[PDB]
Structures are given as structure tokens and as C-alpha cells.
Design a binder for this molecule. Structure first.
Ligand code: HEM
Ligand code: HEM
Ligand code: NA
Ligand code: NA
Lengths: 713, 714
């Protein structure tokens, strides 16, 4: 059947904002995963997982009699889709069980691994999510094989539909770079927000870049992709060598023997795929990647044999039985066990990408340190494995269960504990009046609180106003945050704070994080009063203030808003139209289309635009909270045309006289163009809508202010 | 553009249709009730404002003849005109003309203008009048302004907030003529169900003639077919076409190549409008809409009997408009038709091919002549047909709101008689459930009968459902999916219970068969829970009434026959669309989400609801017990599944280790173990902590289905 996307393939896509509705969720509206998980007998689950490890199923027999390498790969791929650019991907939603990830070529045969876990999932039901179970299974694999993990936290609630993630524009799986939808340009520059070299890969190609078996060039791709997943060189080496201490690859025959991926497979395959016609199609005959490498002499036991082999041999370029490029140790004896025939041994083998860890000079230094000092290796891998598998989990307040590591890690964006009584409702009223008596304006207050709170992204639960990181580097100097204006606001609020905190008894104090948000709340109430309407904006205390030393400035970079349509801001010129970036921002903020619409129309009239731009400020009562954005946008008495200077800026003129009334950007005018968004704008621009507009604006503002408040969850 | 799952797997089933229209996309609060808003609207004030608008010409789209009435009648007829009786989809009832694709169909060109003219009134009255109501009300006021007395009007069409998911065809080219790679025609001009238009982007037919051939006789065939697929017979069809074309004009002042992008394709600066034209002033006298240039009557802004005087009073010659389209001009006629803008110009009478159909098709000619000779008959038929057109998708009369609702009950409304007696109470319900369970009717029989009765409902046009007890009447009683012999036996037993209970009452209390069928079904579900060891309560609301055969139009009922009902593992024949797609379509008509579809189907399988007692998907050894066995067995990896060599749509589930046959299933059964989203939902209900959740969710969805048509309780 032909669909709107067929007819109008470039039209904006709002359905990404309405995913994850109560309609698609099988759990009741009142289900709380954390409450379920907190009563799970986690130790029982781990005993069942430990037993599974060596309980082979004949439909996918265990290599070496142990599923631990398969499950480590499964967990690494669950986490391994994460990109720092947008926070999207990662293990936190269990999306490996849905399309497309369940059918990526790099996820081949992980369908088998997840099917092996259905009995346990069935047994414990809603008390352990698939998302949590994939990671826990990887940890138990590690522990069953003699590796001491760093810990584990539960709390990843399951999702029920595919996420809407941009994974690239190629139309062919695994397409090599330089096609019509190439994700590379320039001198091998990978397009943001992507963090993989080919469509359907986790990070890099195991043969080498676009299949060229050069370990030195492959290392460049490794470094780039892993940095786009928030991993540095030490962590990268630790992870790759750690993982490839275990198990094996599968390439026993030609790939043409492997059939349809799960989403393409017949109904009878019951959710599995990659059925293979090569011999038995499984076990000793399995084909996954097409490579046939076994790294260590004890694939089912932690060891330091990976680096012993890597540095103890020179390596020769060869082909697997499927024709893939891979490496074999020169002159070596047959010392590696076969996965099924106890009478057969094999030479040491390596991937191109493994040899990267010796042949890239910076990696070699780390690898040599880890080979000489395997205890350093083990501790770096434990820490990296916990970061890999937790990087999208959000604040430590979300971590559940008895195995949470106590050590606070800089990458967690930690927030200090609160050790003092909080302000009450009368205190909050006192502080709102003091803020308004200071002379800070509605625009100042709104804009500051907006800046602080709107760094949140629901993709990885980073950002938000908790921490008061807006006062620290690098947030205080981001262009969108108007650094000179911001510093003046913060100085005034810090003086209010000092004065209130100095008058208290009992140890009650207010943090700057809370006062920044409360102050914005006062600005919204004041704006409403300027419009002739008394409203109270909700406020929940309990945010704390992080220090500079507790803030990783490099990792915070990815949270800079380079496009924030809510402030009519674009840092530079992008290929993607500004309205598309607005809906992307809205999705990261967890807003629906109605919420996005009200929020933006209110922010325009409040003075939230960066630089005090008049674009979209369709009011003569700026700093009053009215629906004037919508009534003026929708007025057919005004005609709009792009300016000669800038096609992305439009003038609104009176249709009869030509007199200039307004200017606006694409982000402003989309609300009067897109048929769905216009329908929303009409509700808030109707003559009965003043009360509704204010109430819904207050509700969405409070939602934004609370996005990172998992202490209140 | 970014690659999507639909790009990778373009045939994989689409569940998002079941989760449209969530609370997320709706700007109104979850407790907004449009009916309550509407009932406090000052409808008379609205109508005065509409009357004023008719002659308030805007310079960006100047009014023909100084009166927007013809544009607004066309706007309202196109709002209603997308309706198809096959699935009940389309029509005016959701205001979908303001969203894609309908807002940009070629046949809806310049109706963007019409809607924009109505924004000030919409703004002024806000939530108290929906767009969907306002489009039809405007059409009514246009007719009244121009001297035609309407049959009435009902409000209550709530607005919707995103595009509906309707199959409009498979063509990938607007307006494609027939016989292409995605043709909606095969055979001897057989239009594919559920479609009710000849070309992609048309309302019904091509005004030049079939595939552009200007033959009024063959055009008539397309008209009859498409109109019938919109629930309209010959009398109604002639009344509507001639009634409509009593007003206004078409627009074709220059070549079509002058007309730019439709609204969904236009630039942001167009602010939601489209079809900007570079021909002269682009508007008014110079307007280009269809490409045809026809004005039917000597008074295009006043109700008249001139359409049929012209149609029969002249012989007609084939000509071309200024844009090159085929149309007809009256041979020898004087210039008697006014110009829309220049008082000094007059024009000869002109007609479309499809208008000439009403004279050259022999059946239509007889009706046309009758209307020409008896203009009061014409007026009354058009009034009634205009009301039907604009209300056919509104559902039971209980939904109709406001002071202008016609009192007359019309057959097409599938009327249900008023209840005029006390209803059964809770003690009575318990007494009747006990009687039913003591009769020896089985769980299977009770569940199946109530399912059959209630699951005819479809939310597209709000037809069907268990109210009325139409399952006992023709044609429902004879539908294959309803198991006519079994059904007769059940109905005879329930009628005997009914008669015995009703005969013992005082005070006028009685129970309808419609309620008893539903109550008996509830008792079946209760019994099945008991058989599983579980206490359970199934909610029941009395108040259904029994309709008569005479209140039940058998031909209109035919389109409600389930030819595919995955919930009973039924498919009447072989179809091109795979059975699991048909299941999701049926769930959409039933208003079910994916979790509800899932739980419902797995429970109905174990209760014995399958047609013919088929064992397909009956994955239990305790049939007639309400358990989650369907899910636990479907998900057991100890079973391997393969299609049979006899029928590739039937699968055998064998023990993986022995080969022993354990079960058989269809595509509708197995999709729950294959589709990645459906399987996720099956896993919840197949978990060891899920038995009570399954029962409680099943009871809820069952009750939901039993009450779908209960707009008396709304
Ligand atoms: C440059 C990065 C990496 C590359 C190119 C890569 C590549 C691959 C490939 C091609 C396979 C074989 C799949 C198959 O045929 O079955 C595989 C297996 C595996 N990988 Fe990696 N890998 C990378 C990093 C990792 C990381 C970070 C971990 C975990 C910490 C990991 C753990 C594993 C394990 C445990 C296996 C064995 C699976 C089994 O025994 O079934 N790898 N790797
Ligand atoms: C066989 C069925 C029909 C066909 C092929 C048809 C075709 C058309 C076409 C091509 C136009 C010209 C559009 C333009 O260029 O502006 C039009 C105009 C119009 N039609 Fe029909 N029509 C049909 C039935 C209807 C019905 C059922 C009604 C309403 C009861 C209706 C009412 C109108 C009116 C009032 C106009 C004039 C619009 C104006 O003045 O702007 N027509 N029709
Ligand atoms: Na994420
Ligand atoms: Na409909």
C-alpha cells in the first residue's frame, strides 16, 4: 500500500515523538520495573545462568562445551551500538531483540544466544528485564570463566518497539565506503552521529578497513569508532584483548550457505535466522562472521594468553574457509583446542583488528604493559566492561541491586549526596520573591533555567540541571548559553543563595542547582502574572552541586546544543533542515508533538531566544506568557516569503499593505506549514485557549526541569 | 534519507497502525470529552458566522459569483466522499481532509483554500466545534444560504490529530490509469476491494470518463460501481450528482502545467496551502483546479431546477477546456450561463462526461426524467442523500448531537429500538448465567456465539456489534464464519431461557436476546476460569435491545461479513494479502492495541472459539479452561515448526528430539512466535508469573469487545 512517506519522502517525521505509548506496552500503567527487580532473587538468577553456561542445546551446540564466549559477545554487542554524539544505542533498552539490531549482520547468531536465555527469562518473568538479563548473562559468563567483574546494576526497563535511531543512509547491508550514501567524506571522516564503519557493524570491519587487511589502518578505524563510543585507548585495548581472551569466531564454510536474517526469515523459523546449509549448519560447522579464529589455548578460562600469543608469534596473512582475510602464527605448533574434536588442535590465529593492538604504536605500548602486567590488564578490563555495559544507564540513582560498585566514576557525571534538610514550600516562595526582587528579568530567568535543564537527553539519561554544571566548564562557555549574560545571572543567584543559606538554622541550605531551577520557575510565574494570570509552577528540591573536579570536561562536549530550536539557535550550517533538528531535540527531551509545540510557542514569547533574536517573537508583550505566537503565526492576514539574504529566514508582511510585521526561521514557520504541527498550533491559537496554553506550558516546563530527577523516581 | 526498518523488510507486518491515535499525539487532555463541548456550543451563532462568510470574499482566493457556497459544498462532499463500505474507512467523521494524504490528493485541489477560509470561525469557537463537524456544517450552511432546505445535521465528529492508516491503493503515481503494475482493476473492470475510487487521488470517478475516455455510458458504470461502494444506490446517486452540480462551477482557465506543488510538497512559506498557479493571477477568474471549465446552471448561487432542464433540453457536443480536458457544450445554445467575475460575459451551457451519464445510462435516465418532471421528488431525495452522505460513518443515532438531528429513523442507520422497560439487575444476571450453564451449552459454544455477535463492530464507521441481536437475523445467521448450524442450536437454547425468564417477571422487566447472548458469553468465560481453578468476574452491562429483520438491511449488512477472522482462525478463501496482515487489520477495526490483540487471540484459542473446532493454534491439553497455555506452548523451543507439503499456510510443530507431532498452526497462530514485537508480547504472557495477569487482561479485552457499540453508555 502506498504511504505518506512514499509520496512525500522528505516531509518531517513526527511519529518518533509518539513511540513508546501506553498502547504498545503490555504492562499495566502502574508497573514499576524497579519495584519488581528489587525483589528478584538475583543470586538465584545467577546460579541458573552459571548452570546454563555448560548445558548445551543440540539446536546450537556449545563451543568447547561452554556458551560463555557466545554470551560475552552477546552482551558486548548489546552495549556496543552506543554513540556518544547523541547517546543513542547501547544496552539500556534491550533493543537487540527488535529490528533492525536483531538482524544486523554483526548480530548473526546472537538470536541463538537470546533463545538460550528464554527459559530463565520465563522463569523470573517481569522481575528481570531482557535488557538487564543480556548484561547479567555476560557478567556470569565472565565470572564462570574465572574473571572478577567490577559489579553490576539492574534497572534497564524493557521496551516494546523498535527505537527510531539513525544508523546511516546506506541501502545495502555492509556497504563499503564511497557509495552514493557514503558515511565517510574528506580524509576518512565518519559522519556524526554514526559510530561504525559500515551499515550493520558494531564498530569496525574485522578484516580491516573496507576489507583491506592492514592492521595499522584498521587501528585508525578502531580508535575513531571506540572514541565515538566514549572509550579511550587504554579502555579500547583492554576491551578487545579482554573479550578475545574467550571463545572463537565461526567461518567453517562459505557464507553463501547462510540464509535470511531473522526479520526476513520464514514464519516457521520462529524468530531465528541465518539458517545455514553448510553441513550440520551449527556447532563445528557454524558460520557467523565467516572468520575462523580461536585466540587462546584455554578459550573457556580467563588467562593472559591473548597477549602471550600476540607478541610471542609473527603473523601470516591467510584465508578462512569462507574466504575472509585472517592471520595465523608462523612456525607455531598446534596448541589451540578444537571446539568439538578433542583429538584436534590448531595453530594460533588472529584478526587484522587484533594485530592492530601490536602494530599501532600507541596501542603497542598499552598492550605491552598489559602483557608484562596482567593484573593491570584484568583491572582495566573489569572497569571498561562495567563502563561499556552501564554507559547509557544514567545517573547512579537508577542503579539497582546488591552488586552496584561503590566507587564513583568520573564518567558517571556524579552528583554529590545531599546531607542536609531541604527547603520547604514557604522557603521556595521566599526565594522566588527574592529572585524577582533582584531585578533579574523573566527572559534572564527562563533562559538560564532552560539552558541548565535542556541538556538532558533520554537516549543515555545524561544531562539536566542536577549538578549545577552550567556554572562549570565547559557549559558556562557554550555559545548557546550566552556566556556573559549567564555569568551575570549566576552571580546574582549565588548572592541570593549565600544570603539565604547564611540565615538558616538546622543545617538547611539550598543548592545552586535547585535555585537555578526555582528561579526559572519564578520567571514563568512572573510571566504569567504579566499576562494577567496567577499560577504556581511546581518545584521539587533536592538537586546538588557538582564540582569541577567531579566533571569530565571532554565527555561533556557531546552535550553541547549545537542546534536548539527552542532557543531558535543553530551554531552553524547543517545539511539536515533546522525543523528536523528541532524534532530530534524534542525526542531527546522526551517530548511529544503537543509538548514540543506548547513549549516552543511559550519560550518565544518569554525571551528565550539566544541573542535576543526577534525571529519567531510574534508578540507585542514579550515576557508575558500568552498564546500570541500561535494566534499571530496562524493569522492569514500575514504573508510570508524567504529573504534574499538568507533563504532560511522569512519575512511576515501584511498581505494588504506590505508592511513588515515579523521575521521567523524554519523552526518558527514549520508550525504553520506541517499539517500535523499546524493542527496543534490551531488548538493553542484558538480564542478559548488561554487557560489551556498556560496550564500546558507550566506542565511541560516542569517536566523539562525534572528530566534527570531519578532521585524522585 | 535515513534507512528504516520498512526499507530493509518491506513486507514485515506493521503494528504501528494499532498504536495510532495515542494520548501522546493528542493535544487535548485525556479526559476531554468533545460531546460535552459541542453540546454547549452556540450552534446558531456558528451558523450566522458561516452565513456571513459565504459572501465575504478574500483576495487571496476570490469567491466565484461573489459566493463561496459551491466551493464549500464540494469541500463537504469531498470530506464525506472518501468513504468505503467495504471496511467503513474514509468519510467525514474524523476530519481527515486536513491531514496527509487527503489534504493533497489531486481531487482535493484548492480545498486547502476552503479550509483556510474557515480558520477564523474555528478559532473563534475553539474546541467546542471540531474541524470534522465544521466541514459538514459549512456545507449545510452553503446549501441553506443558496436556498436549499436541508434534512438536518448532527454534531459529534471528534477531531483526530494524525493521519489515519488507510489503504488507498498500491499505485506509486498520482492518478495512474488502469492496467499498470499496481492496477486496482482486473478482469472486466473489477475494482479491488476495499477501494471505492477509479484512480489514486480521486474521490469516486474520473470526470472525463473511464481512464480519460469521454464515454458517458461507460462512465456511468464506474459511477454506479464506486457509488455503490460508498453505500449509495441509483436514486441516491443521481440525486447527489445533479443536486451538487446545481451549484457553482469547475476551474480550468489555463494549462495544468501552471499549477505547482500540492500542500505536502510545497515550501514552508506556503504555510500549509498548495497548488499555487503561475496562470495569470492564479486565482478567481484565472483559477485552475480540475482542469475542466464547466458551469452547470444559469443561477450557480441559487438552488434551481436548471440542471435537468439543461441536461435534457440540449444535445451535447464533445469539446475541450482551456487546459485540454474533455467536456461537453450545448449545441446551438445561446450564452445564458453567467460568468463568475465579468458581468459582461455569458457562456453556453456545459456538462461533464459524468453528468451526461445521468441521461445516457438507461437506468439513470429514468430517474433523471422523473426528477426533471417532479422537482419536489428531486429536492427531497437530494436532501435525504446529502444527510446520508455526510452521516454514513457516524454510527448509531446515539452518537448524534445537537438541536438539528432529524427525528426520522433511517434504515441505513441500522437502528436499534428504544428500551422501554426495567433492565435486569445483578441478581437477575446471576440467575441467568446459572440457567445458561445448567442448559448444557459448553464454554466453546457460549464464547464462540458471543464473539460472533460482538466482533462485527468496526470503529471506522461504528457499524456492527452485539447490540440489536442481529446475529439471529439474515444475513448474519447464515455467515460461514458464524457456524450457522451450531449457532442455531445455541440461539434456540438461549431463546428458550429468555422466554422462561421473561414470562416469570413482573413490572415489565425483561431481558433482550442481545443482552442474553453477551451474558451467556460472559458465563462461558467465567466457567472457563473455574475450569482452570480460578475465581473470576466478568463485567456485564445490560441495555442492548433487539432489532427486527425489517430494521436490518440485508445488503448493507453484507459488508460486515468476516471473511478473515484470525481470532477464530478463519479464512473464507485464499487472498493475496497474508493472513497475519488481515489479523492486524481486524484488530484495528476492533480498536485493539497489540497487547490486546495478543491476549485476546491466545485466550480465544484455548476456549474453543475456532471455526469448525479446528485444532490449529489450540496449544493446550485443557481446552475450555482459561489459561495462558497458548503462549507457554507456542514459545517452547522444544518444538520445531515446518510448513506442510499439502498446504504451505499450515504448519506442524514437532518435538525437536523425537519428531513426534505435537501441534498444528496457521500463519495467524505462528506469527506470535515470529514477529519480533509480537513475540515480545507473547513472552510476557507466557512467563511463569503471568497466569493471573493473562486472566485479568483477557477479561478486560473481552469486556471491551462486548461493549464496543455501547454508545448508550458513552
Ligand atoms: C575492534 C573491535 C572488535 C572486533 C573487530 C571484533 C570482532 C569479532 C568477530 C568478527 C567475532 C566472530 C563472530 C563469529 O564469527 O562468531 C568476534 C567474537 C567475539 N568477540 Fe569480538 N571484536 C571486537 C571487540 C570485542 C569486544 C570489545 C569484546 C568484549 C569485551 C568482544 C568479545 C568477543 C567474544 C567473547 C567473541 C567470541 C564469541 C564466541 O565464542 O561465540 N569482541 N569478535
Ligand atoms: C460522479 C460524481 C462526480 C464527479 C465526477 C464530480 C466532478 C467534479 C469536478 C471535476 C468538479 C470541479 C472541481 C474544480 O475544478 O473546481 C466538481 C465541482 C463540484 N461538485 Fe462535483 N462531481 C461529482 C459528484 C458531486 C457530488 C455528489 C456533489 C455534492 C452533492 C458535488 C458537488 C460539487 C460542487 C458544488 C462543485 C462546484 C465547486 C465550486 O463551485 O467551486 N459533485 N465536481
Ligand atoms: Na541510548
Ligand atoms: Na471511516
Amino acid at each position: 500500500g502506498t504511504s505518506n512517506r512514499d509520496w512525500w519522502p522528505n516531509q518531517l517525521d513526527l511519529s518518533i515523538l509518539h513511540r513508546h505509548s501506553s498502547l504498545s506496552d503490555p504492562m499495566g500503567k502502574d508497573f514499576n520495573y524497579a519495584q519488581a527487580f528489587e525483589k528478584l532473587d538475583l543470586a538465584a538468577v545467577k546460579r541458573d545462568l552459571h548452570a546454563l553456561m555448560t548445558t548445551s542445546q543440540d539446536w546450537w551446540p556449545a563451543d568447547f562445551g561452554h556458551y560463555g564466549g557466545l554470551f560475552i559477545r552477546m552482551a558486548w554487542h548489546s552495549a556496543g551500538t552506543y554513540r556518544t554524539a547523541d547517546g543513542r544505542g547501547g544496552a539500556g533498552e534491550g533493543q537487540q531483540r527488535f529490528a533492525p539490531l536483531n538482524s544486523w549482520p554483526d548480530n548473526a547468531n546472537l538470536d541463538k544466544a537470546r533463545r538460550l536465555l528464554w527459559p530463565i527469562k520465563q522463569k523470573y518473568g517481569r522481575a528481570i528485564s531482557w535488557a538487564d538479563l543480556l548484561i547479567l548473562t555476560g557478567n556470569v559468563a565472565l565470572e564462570s570463566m574465572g574473571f572478577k567483574t567490577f559489579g553490576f546494576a539492574g534497572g534497564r526497563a524493557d521496551t516494546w518497539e523498535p527505537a527510531d535511531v539513525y544508523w546511516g543512509s546506506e541501502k545495502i547491508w555492509l556497504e563499503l565506503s564511497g557509495g552514493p550514501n557514503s558515511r565517510y567524506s574528506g580524509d576518512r571522516q565518519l559522519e556524526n552521529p554514526l559510530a561504525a564503519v559500515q551499515m550493520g557493524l558494531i564498530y569496525v570491519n574485522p578484516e580491516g578497513p573496507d576489507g583491506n587487511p592492514d592492521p595499522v589502518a584498521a587501528a585508525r578505524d578502531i580508535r575513531d569508532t571506540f572514541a565515538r563510543m566514549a572509550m579511550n585507548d587504554e579502555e579500547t585495548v583492554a576491551l578487545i584483548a579482554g573479550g578475545h581472551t574467550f571463545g572463537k569466531t565461526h567461518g567453517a564454510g562459505p557464507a553463501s550457505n547462510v540464509g535470511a536474517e531473522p526479520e526476513a526469515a520464514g514464519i516457521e523459523a520462529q524468530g531465528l535466522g541465518w539458517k545455514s546449509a553448510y553441513r550440520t549448519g551449527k556447532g563445528a560447522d557454524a558460520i557467523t562472521s565467516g572468520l575462523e579464529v580461536t585466540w587462546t589455548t584455554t578459550p573457556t578460562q580467563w588467562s593472559h594468553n591473548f597477549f602471550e600469543n600476540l607478541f610471542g608469534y609473527e603473523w601470516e596473512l591467510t584465508k578462512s574457509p569462507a574466504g575472509a582475510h585472517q592471520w595465523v602464527a608462523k612456525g607455531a605448533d598446534a596448541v589451540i583446542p578444537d571446539a568439538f574434536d578433542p583429538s584436534k588442535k590448531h595453530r594460533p590465529t588472529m584478526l587484522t583488528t587484533d594485530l592492530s593492538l601490536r602494530f599501532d604504536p600507541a596501542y603497542e605500548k598499552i598492550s605491552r604493559r598489559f602483557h608484562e602486567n596482567p593484573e593491570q590488564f584484568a583491572d582495566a578490563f573489569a572497569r571498561a566492561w562495567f563502563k561499556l555495559t552501564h554507559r547509557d544507564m544514567g545517573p547512579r540513582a537508577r542503579y539497582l541491586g546488591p552488586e552496584v560498585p561503590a566507587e564513583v566514576l568520573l564518567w558517571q557525571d556524579p552528583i554529590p549526596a545531599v546531607d542536609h534538610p531541604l527547603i520547604d514550600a514557604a522557603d521556595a516562595a521566599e526565594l522566588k520573591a527574592k529572585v524577582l526582587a533582584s531585578g533579574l528579568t523573566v527572559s534572564q530567568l527562563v533562559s538560564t533555567a532552560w539552558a541548565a535543564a535542556s541538556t538532558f537527553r533520554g537516549s543515555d539519561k545524561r544531562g539536566g540541571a542536577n549538578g549545577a554544571r552550567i556554572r562549570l566548564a565547559p557549559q558556562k562557555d557554550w555559545e548557546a548559553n550566552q556566556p556573559e549574560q549567564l555569568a551575570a545571572v549566576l552571580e546574582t543567584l549565588e548572592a541570593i543563595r549565600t544570603a539565604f543559606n547564611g540565615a538558616q538554622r538546622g543545617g538547611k541550605q539550598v543548592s545552586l542547582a535547585d535555585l537555578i531551577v526555582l528561579a526559572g520557575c519564578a520567571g514563568v510565574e512572573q510571566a504569567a502574572k504579566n499576562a494577567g494570570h496567577a499560577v504556581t509552577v511546581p518545584f521539587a528540591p533536592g538537586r546538588a552541586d557538582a564540582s569541577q573536579e567531579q566533571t569530565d570536561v571532554e565527555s561533556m562536549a557531546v552535550l553541547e546544543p549545537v542546534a536548539d530550536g527552542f532557543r531558535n539557535y543553530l551554531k552553524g550550517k547543517y545539511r539536515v533542515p533546522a525543523e528536523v533538528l528541532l524534532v530530534d531535540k524534542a525526542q531527546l527531551l522526551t517530548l511529544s508533538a503537543p509538548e514540543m509545540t506548547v513549549l516552543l510557542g511559550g519560550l518565544r514569547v518569554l525571551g528565550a531566544n539566544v541573542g535576543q533574536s526577534r525571529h519567531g517573537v510574534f508578540t507585542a508583550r514579550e515576557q508575558a506568557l500568552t498564546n500570541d505566537f500561535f494566534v499571530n503565526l496562524l493569522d492569514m492576514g500575514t504573508e510570508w516569503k524567504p529573504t534574499a539574504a538568507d533563504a532560511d529566514v522569512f519575512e511576515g508582511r501584511d498581505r494588504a499593505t506590505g508592511e513588515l510585521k515579523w521575521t521567523g526561521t524554519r523552526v518558527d514557520l514549520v508550525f504553520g506549514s506541517h499539517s500535523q504541527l499546524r493542527a496543534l498550533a490551531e488548538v493553542y491559537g484558538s480564542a478559548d485557549a488561554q487557560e489551556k496554553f498556560v496550564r500546558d506550558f507550566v506542565a511541560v516546563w516542569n517536566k523539562v526541569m525534572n528530566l534527570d530527577r531519578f532521585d524522585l523516581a
